[PDB]
Amino acid sequence: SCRNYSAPRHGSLAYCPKKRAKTTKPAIKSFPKDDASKPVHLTGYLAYKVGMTHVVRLSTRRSKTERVLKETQKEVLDAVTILEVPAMRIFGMVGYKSTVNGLKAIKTVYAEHLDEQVLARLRKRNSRSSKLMFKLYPQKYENGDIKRDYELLKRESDVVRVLAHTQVSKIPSLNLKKAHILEIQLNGGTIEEKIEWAIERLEKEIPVSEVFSQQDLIDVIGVTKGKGKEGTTKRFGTTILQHKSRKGKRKVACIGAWHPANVRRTVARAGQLGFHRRTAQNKKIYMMGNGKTPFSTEYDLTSKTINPMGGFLRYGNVKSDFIMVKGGIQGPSKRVLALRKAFAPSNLGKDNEEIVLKFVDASSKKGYGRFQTTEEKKAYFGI
């Protein structure tokens, strides 16, 4: 018989099976379309999640048809996330070829001198090594093997990508001695131009200001917070049963009909929740800056850094460059994230508007924070 009343499904089947992610560091798996009409540029980067705060911005957005004469301006309060982005270092390149089975890698070429931080990823246990890792490779520079290698890459390739690592030693709160390694794609120009651009930059440091600027739209890829094994009420959102029932209320009561004589994959069951890969599209950059240069607005004539009183709770003080973005972002503090240029441009009016800040909150995140600087606390109390 048909059910008595209509209702929507619980949870989305776009994310089933909901299994645990394999490792905590994401690869950018998809990149925006190349265009030979533009200069050679990079398309992505790595970042670390610091924490959250709030800001006040001015706005003037209204319906184009609204008949009001006056150029109304209005304050809006918004929550923001802070990400730390030290410069990445380039250490090699890869070329790929198109086939009936997709892209396949032809060869990889590495710089003559490599850092202790990057060699540390290649071994499993840090404190137990003979360190004979890349010691024979430098001969290939003398032999001309490098010059033969570049020829083959230049002759037979469709897509070129660089290899870059992050300078973990600059962020002590991570307790980490192995760098993270990411493969990043180059768009613009021809294969030859791409290869020459790469060759000029092996061993050097690229700042985040190469890749992104204020007001840009970007996509953020990360792994969510973990929550362990959980029941259907939390995993899929199903309703709790009648209060006087025996054998438990926090369950789906009926898990199928008599035929077919099996359970369907569409029914909710208990299991893992959290620690999955998720991508957030079209987030907007409100600000870019540095952890130890003070700043001011046109209206707030105090001069202060981004760091709140006492630092972010399990991190401390930002020291390197940073990005600020609208809304919340995947995962807890200290997790690695991958940043990408937006896959396609947005038509929505909320996305394409300007941003003008007047205040940024710098009060303590432990307890009720009631001062913006140590000077105010010293003035409120005696002496």
């Binding site: 006040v56 707030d300 205040f359 009720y368 913006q372």
Partner: protein, 65 residues
């Protein structure tokens, strides 16, 4: 930037925190937190709550008008 000054405690309130309570007498009043709103309801006199800026001024621990 401040939201204002708390009615009961005397404490200045940061932008984006605290709440206004509006009575049927037609008055609007600003409180720092739920703590001090509740003390008003229970008719605890502020001068007896010794950490308040009000109490400290009344005792003459802090220079005031």
């Amino acid at each position: 930037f401040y939201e204002g000054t708390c009615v009961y405690s005397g404490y200045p309130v940061p932008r984006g925190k605290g709440t206004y309570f509006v009575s049927l007498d037609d008055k609007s009043s600003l409180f720092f937190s739920s703590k001090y709103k509740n003390f008003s309801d229970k008719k605890i006199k502020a001068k007896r709550v010794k950490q308040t800026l009000m109490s400290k001024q009344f005792c003459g621990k802090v220079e005031s008008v």
